[PDB]
């Protein structure tokens, strides 16, 4: 199962001239395109070696698309100051995420399209892709405007059309790093503590793609709120890392079990110390 996802952000900077508009594109967990309005002569650039041999007609079309969006977000930004009556002195943040989840058989499972203002949800396209969900009475103004204007339809057409078509195309050119599943390197480590007991940390290194669960068990029972867990972090080699740890009594470190589930694991691992 593959996905093509785009993350868009525009942030205002009062006094500090025009706001910053940027776009980052991903396939699965792999970055491949970038946009930044603070670069002089703002144009679209490749962020993965396997995409750069797309042609100029592609990039120019992508420069055209972004710059067009750059305008909508400046205009959208000022509208936010009236829906909410906020100062024209402070800077604000508007977010946007759109993409598609596609099964290996070319069929999609889910498509996203959704906006967030000042770090909080705002409006979002529903799973069924037909009506909008507005967060508040400031966001519901937009709903009516876009329902009458039949906005939802055009949005739906990208997801169903171009997104699927270009993912199938993307997936044939960068298959070296995209069509790959690399297994986790797991183990458990022991660390004595000043407080008199022990910290057991479970490791999972070098796996790809990035979806993974790490878990601790005390003879079959899970200690979720007892473990401390970091977020999945990139190792920078196309692979990822993660760990989770618990605190156990000296002498009972071997009663606790650690499990790792991933695509790169034919059968789910089980580890102890």
């Amino acid at each position: 199962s593959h996905s093509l996802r785009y993350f868009v952000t525009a942030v205002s900077r009062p006094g500090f001239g025009e706001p910053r508009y940027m776009e980052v594109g991903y396939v699965d967990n792999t970055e491949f395109v970038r946009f930044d309005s603070d670069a002089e002569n703002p144009r679209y650039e490749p962020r993965a070696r396997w995409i750069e041999q797309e042609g100029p007609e592609y990039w120019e079309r992508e420069t055209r698309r972004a710059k067009g969006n750059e305008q909508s977000f400046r205009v959208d930004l000022r509208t936010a100051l009236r829906y909410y009556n906020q100062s024209a002195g402070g800077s604000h943040t508007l977010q946007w995420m759109a993409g598609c989840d596609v099964e290996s058989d070319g069929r999609l499972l889910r498509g996203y399209w959704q906006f967030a203002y000042d770090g909080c949800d705002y409006i979002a396209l529903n799973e069924d892709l037909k009506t909008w969900t507005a967060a508040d009475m400031a966001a519901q103004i937009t709903r009516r405007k876009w329902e009458q204007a039949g906005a939802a339809e055009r949005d739906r057409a990208y997801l169903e059309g171009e997104c699927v078509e270009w993912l199938r195309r993307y997936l044939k050119n960068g298959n070296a790093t995209l069509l790959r599943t690399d297994p986790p390197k797991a183990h458990v480590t022991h660390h004595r503590r000043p407080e008199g007991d022990v910290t057991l940390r479970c490791w999972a290194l070098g796996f790809y793609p990035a979806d993974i669960t790490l878990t601790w068990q005390l003879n079959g029972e899970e200690l979720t709120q007892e473990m401390e867990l970091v977020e999945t972090r990139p190792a920078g080699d196309g692979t990822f890392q993660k760990w989770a740890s618990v605190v156990v009594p000296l002498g009972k470190e071997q009663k606790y079990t650690c499990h790792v589930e991933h695509e790169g694991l034919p059968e789910p691992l089980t580890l102890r110390w």
Partner: peptide, 10 residues
């Protein structure tokens, strides 16, 4: 290829 706001503004 990304999506376009198509000037569907709020």
């Amino acid at each position: 290829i990304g999506p376009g706001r198509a000037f569907y503004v709020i």
